[PDB]
Structures are given as structure tokens and as C-alpha cells.
């Protein structure tokens, strides 16, 4: 009998969503000129990982980047000169995510091992060692990202996100609500809100302070793999196994535009925006990335450079570069 | 500025030395994914051979790391994709259950036709054969009730039954093996193959079996790349 009012209230919510929908992001945007024909080529190709890369994260200085590979390596690259800076050997070789702290002092990584390891890069001695291991999740960690040096947000395969105070080591907050594996995590520029996409084809917005989900977004047809806020933080984009990306705005609480093609039939693995938010970059399972005009939903370019599955994709804060890591163990920088 | 660049190049050299030193080690060992149900005796086999339960066994100067994934939740659609590069999947089945056997077949079928898990060979162990023989002799539970097609199955001429084994036990055994191999050969495309084995809980010759299957897998990989097979 409870499902009855649940269902009717969902109907009321859907009716409100339909009422709030007057115009789509297709007629309003059609008036502006098309973005063009963006062609990019590999400025730098970083080589050194033995196995396939899963994740990577730029620095805030747009210089350095960490990358995680299944041989158990967390390798920091200097992007301009292709030199390595650090090569950290992991306790567990099944790392599915990594983060580079915004202050640049710390790196995080975790995966099937169920623990998020945090490493400091600027010890007095000089070497890089285990700063602290955070445990408490009962599933693989799909993503982790830093609020600051002393507070990190993680998302696990046990349908839960966790906000950790690093000094004490305990999960300050436990965000619950998702039905399936939480696969991706993206944080707002204000570091007060963050969206998380899971396998139940749902993305949930969380307030870090409140500890309870503020809004929920559905519209996909399969598992969500990647998610990313629009640069201003009033929207975000998600990629799934549907071979479709979608853009959701927080205030409108409704899907705005979907990016999909008849030809494309493989799922999205990674999604990132540009500095301006005009170009949405999505890595697909067909071994190459596609660049969409985020406004007109056209296909603006193609980063066809990788031999295997494109796993991770990221864009510098400066906006000068795009890193793409794939399952053929090669990082590529595009411009 | 020259000093900084020289120091950076020195650091990159000292790092690349370590990666060169570790690449040999990484290429030497072979990684194996151990899958099986709770009922299936994968725990006992890994215990006899010896979050994520990693074990390592060394035979004939070759090292294998078996990675039983135990800490995760029921769903495996996403964590499985981590094992595209393993040499083999060791898939263990409790063959004396008769009720959770179609579960095993469904899982094997899902593994076989996975896009990422394709081109991966499966070494299939059919554990608890003692219990299956005891059950078939007992005759309390009839297999046909669970698998109708077994009412017309015939033991094939290529079968090699153990001495002093009743024809009933052989017939049931090879029925189960054929149930798996139908799925295996339905869509293989020659990239990967299934290697079925008949093992007991008091069997101590498993490690050599995995070594033999891994050698065969790597031999086939080399032969196909040289286009000799």
C-alpha cells in the first residue's frame, strides 16, 4: 500500500517536471553559429605503464598528472617535458581510481582492495610513503576526489559514498541512497556539492555538510560510468552503457540534451568538459574519443589515436590540454 | 633553469631503471581469476594449493597468482572487467548439487560471451565428484528431473572412465561436462577455449593441471600470432 503513494507521488513529480519544461536546448541553441571542425593531434605521448590505465587526474597547476595502472603503478608525469617525477608501487594491483590533491601534496588511489590509500609527495626525507589508509567500505572504490588536504570524498561499489576526515581516518559522513554500484564521482567548484552516478541508471546530488541527497536524476537506460560538472557548477554531464551522454541542470532538475548517434553503439567510459564548457569530450568503448559541441549536440571532432579501450579522459584547469588514458597502456595529450 | 632540467632528467632515468627492472617480473608471473560459488569447493582447492584473497603458487619455475574475489557484493558486471588480461579463469563447479548447476552454466555462459572477457580461456574444474558418485549410486535424487535431455544422453566413445566406475556415474559425469562444452563451443571463434577437468576434494594434482592448461593457452597464443594454427 506504501508503493501506491510512492508511485502517485512519482507521477506528480514527473508532471511537475513536464510542466517546468517549456523549451528544449535545441531551438534556443540552434540560432548560434556551429562550433566548427575541431581537429586535435597528440602533442605528447606518455609511455611507461605496463598494464592498462584506469584513471588519472591533472594537477591544479596544469603541469603534473598522476596515472593509475593495473600493474600496480601510480606514476606522476610532467606533461610539458614527458619526464616522470614519481613512480609509486601499490600494495594492490587492482586500482580503479586515483586523485591528485588540489594543493599537490597528496595522491589517493583505491580499487578492489576496498581501501583508499593516501600518499604524501613532500616528505622531509624525500621518498613517497603511505600517509594513511582509509577503510570502511565493503565494495570496490570506483572514484575518489579531494575537497582539501584533510578531507576526501570517495564512492564505492557497495552503493555508498563516504566523506572522510583524513587526520582521524574515519568517514565523517556516509552518503547512502543508490541502488547499484556507484561508479563515478564529480565535485562542484565550490566543493560544497557533488554528484555521483551509479549502476541503477541514476545520478544523485549530495550536499557535503547535510549528508543527505538533495536531488536525483534519471533518464539513462543502463549503468552510468562517468560524470562531470559543467565548469560553472549549475549543470553536469553523464556517460553510460547506452552509448549516450546526457546533460542535467541542477536548478531545472531535468535532462536538457542528449548526445548520441545511430552509428555509435558502445558505452561511454569517461566524460570531461572544456574550460569554457562549450566542448564536451567523451571517451567510448570503440577505442576512440568524440568531441561534442555541448550546446548544439553536434559531433565536432574525434580523438582517434588509441589502440584499445579508452578508459579515462581529463582536461587541465588552464584548459590548455586533454589527457586520454586507454587500455593499451598509453597516455596521450591533445591540444 | 638548466639545473632543474638536468635533475628532472636524472629522476626520470632513475625511475625508468626501476620500471625496466619490474617489467621482467610482471611479464614472468601469470595471473588467474578464481571464480566459483559458495557451495563449490574453491576454498578447499585454494587451501590445498596454499578483501581480495590473493594466493601465489610456483611450479616448474613459473609463478601464478590466483585472485579470488570475495569482498565484493553479489553484482560482478563491473569488477569482472578488471580481468581482461589474466591468463585464465579458473571456474569451479559443485557438480553434485543438481539444483544450483544451471546457475553455474548461466555464469559460464555470461563469462564466455563477455566482450571484455572474450579471448580468455577458462580452466573448468568440476569439484565434488565423490559426492556425485555417491548420489548417483544412492539414486534418491534423479538427474533427469533437473535435466530432461539426460534421459537420452549417451556416453561418447571418446570417454575414458576410471577403473571400477559404474556406467551411471560416467554417464552423469560426461553429461555435465558436455553441458558446459556446448556453451563453450557455441561461440568461440577460436580466440579462447574451455579446458574441463574432473577433480575431487582430496585431489592434490590440480596445480600441475593449471600449469598444463596455461602452457597450452600460451602455446596457442603464440601459434595463432605466427599464423601456424
Amino acid at each position, epitope marked *: 500500500q506504501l508503493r501506491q503513494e510512492a508511485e502517485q507521488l512519482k507521477n506528480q513529480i514527473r508532471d511537475a517536471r513536464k510542466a517546468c519544461a517549456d523549451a528544449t536546448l535545441s531551438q534556443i541553441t540552434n540560432n548560434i553559429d556551429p562550433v566548427g571542425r575541431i581537429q586535435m593531434r597528440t602533442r605528447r605521448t606518455l609511455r611507461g605503464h605496463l598494464a592498462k590505465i584506469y584513471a588519472m587526474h591533472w594537477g591544479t597547476d596544469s603541469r603534473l598528472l598522476v596515472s593509475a595502472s593495473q600493474d600496480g603503478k601510480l606514476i606522476i608525469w610532467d606533461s610539458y617535458t614527458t619526464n616522470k617525477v614519481h613512480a609509486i608501487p601499490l600494495r594492490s594491483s587492482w586500482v580503479m581510481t586515483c586523485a591528485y590533491a588540489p594543493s599537490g601534496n597528496y595522491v589517493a588511489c583505491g580499487g578492489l582492495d576496498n581501501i583508499c590509500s593516501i600518499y604524501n609527495l613532500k616528505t622531509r626525507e624525500g621518498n613517497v610513503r603511505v600517509s594513511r589508509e582509509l577503510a570502511g567500505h565493503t565494495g570496490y572504490l570506483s572514484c575518489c576526489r579531494f575537497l582539501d588536504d584533510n578531507q576526501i570524498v570517495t564512492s564505492s561499489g557497495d552503493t555508498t559514498c563516504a566523506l572522510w576526515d583524513i587526520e582521524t581516518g574515519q568517514q565523517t559522513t556516509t552518503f547512502t541512497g543508490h541502488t547499484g554500484d556507484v561508479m563515478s564521482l564529480s565535485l562542484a567548484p565550490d566543493t560544497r556539492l557533488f554528484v555521483s552516478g551509479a549502476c541503477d541508471a541514476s545520478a544523485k546530488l549530495w550536499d557535503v555538510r547535510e549528508g543527505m541527497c538533495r536531488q536525483t536524476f534519471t533518464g539513462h537506460e543502463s549503468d552510468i560510468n562517468a560524470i562531470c560538472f559543467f565548469p560553472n557548477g549549475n549543470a553536469f554531464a553523464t556517460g553510460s552503457d547506452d552509448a549516450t551522454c546526457r546533460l542535467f541542470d541542477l536548478r531545472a532538475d531535468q535532462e536538457l540534451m542528449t548526445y548520441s548517434h545511430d552509428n555509435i553503439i558502445c558505452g561511454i567510459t569517461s566524460v570531461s568538459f572544456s574550460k569554457s564548457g562549450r566542448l564536451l569530450l567523451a571517451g567510448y568503448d570503440d577505442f576512440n574519443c568524440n568531441v561534442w559541441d555541448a550546446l548544439k549536440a553536434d559531433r565536432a571532432g574525434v580523438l582517434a589515436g588509441h589502440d584499445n579501450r579508452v578508459s579515462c579522459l581529463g582536461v587541465t584547469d588552464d584548459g590548455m590540454a586533454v589527457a586520454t588514458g586507454s587500455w593499451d597502456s598509453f597516455l596521450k595529450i591533445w591540444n | 633553469q638548466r639545473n632543474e632540467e638536468k635533475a628532472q632528467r636524472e629522476a626520470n632515468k632513475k625511475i625508468e631503471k626501476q620500471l625496466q627492472k619490474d617489467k621482467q617480473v610482471y611479464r614472468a608471473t601469470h595471473r588467474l581469476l578464481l571464480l566459483g560459488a559458495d557451495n563449490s569447493g574453491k576454498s578447499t582447492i585454494v587451501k590445498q594449493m596454499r578483501g581480495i584473497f590473493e594466493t601465489k603458487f610456483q611450479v616448474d619455475k613459473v609463478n601464478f597468482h590466483m585472485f579470488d574475489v570475495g569482498g565484493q557484493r553479489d553484482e560482478r558486471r563491473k569488477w569482472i572487467q578488471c580481468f581482461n588480461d589474466v591468463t585464465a579463469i579458473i571456474f569451479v563447479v559443485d557438480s553434485s548439487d543438481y539444483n544450483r548447476l544451471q546457475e553455474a552454466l548461466n555464469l559460464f555462459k555470461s563469462i564466455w560471451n563477455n566482450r571484455w572477457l572474450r579471448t580468455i580461456s577458462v580452466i573448468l574444474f568440476l569439484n565434488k565428484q565423490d559426492l556425485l558418485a555417491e548420489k548417483v549410486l544412492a539414486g534418491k535424487s534423479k538427474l533427469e528431473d533437473y535435466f530432461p535431455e539426460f534421459a537420452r544422453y549417451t556416453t561418447p566413445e571418446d570417454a575414458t572412465p576410471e577403473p571400477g566406475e559404474d556406467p551411471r556415474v560416467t554417464r552423469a559425469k560426461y553429461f555435465i561436462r558436455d553441458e558446459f562444452l556446448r556453451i563453450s563451443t557455441a*561461440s568461440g571463434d577460436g580466440r579462447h577455449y574451455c579446458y574441463p577437468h574432473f577433480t575431487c576434494a582430496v585431489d592434490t594434482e590440480n596445480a600441475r593441471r593449471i600449469f598444463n592448461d596455461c602452457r597450452d593457452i600460451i602455446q596457442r597464443m603464440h601459434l595463432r600470432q605466427y599464423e601456424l594454427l
Partner: nanobody
Amino acid sequence: QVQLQESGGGLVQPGGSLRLSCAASGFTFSNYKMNWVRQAPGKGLEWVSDISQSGASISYTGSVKGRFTISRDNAKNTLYLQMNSLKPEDTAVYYCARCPAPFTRDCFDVTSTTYAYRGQGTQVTV
């Protein structure tokens, strides 16, 4: 969103007949292999049948083979299971399930305890 709604079933005497229906919404029904599973009272989730995208390849669990018929109609986006000659080990809650991803012929986690793409199911008792 992805919504699977089951219908049909009830109390039928042994040797009777039933027709289980599944209405799908929120996804392209034509592109996913669809399954039927059952939850027996006090037992675990058991896969019962599956049918491929176009219905070319249909499969059943050995127990129910020969008396259940699976089908799908993509015009009205519906899945059907015809139940014939019921016996009192067939009583269960029947769940319609959708395969995790499109354009695939493997289907993982369909019998998982908290799968995300199954309906509420219907009680079929005899």
C-alpha cells in the same frame, strides 16, 4: 526511468494454465535480452528463462522445459510467459528482468539479490 511492471498470476489448481505479462518502459525494449526469474518461498533467486533481442534464441531452465513458453512483442514493448501444467513446486514470486546492457548476448547479475533492472514481480501460487 527503467520500469518493469509484471502482471498476471494468482491461485490456480495444479495442471492449470497461467499467462505472465511484463510491460516495459523507460528503455528501448527491442535491444535487450529479457529474462524471467522466480523467487521460491524460502529459496534463492532462480533463473527460469530468457529470450534474445529478436526472439530468435529462447532458452529455459531444465526443470520447466517443455511446459513454459517465452515470447516477446516489441510492437507494444511487452514480454510474455505462458505457463502450462502447473505443479506445486512452481509456486514463487516471478520477476521480469532486463539484461544489464544493450547489444550483448551475456547477462550478468540478473539473479542478484538487489538487481536494479527487475520489476516487483507477481505471486504465482498453486
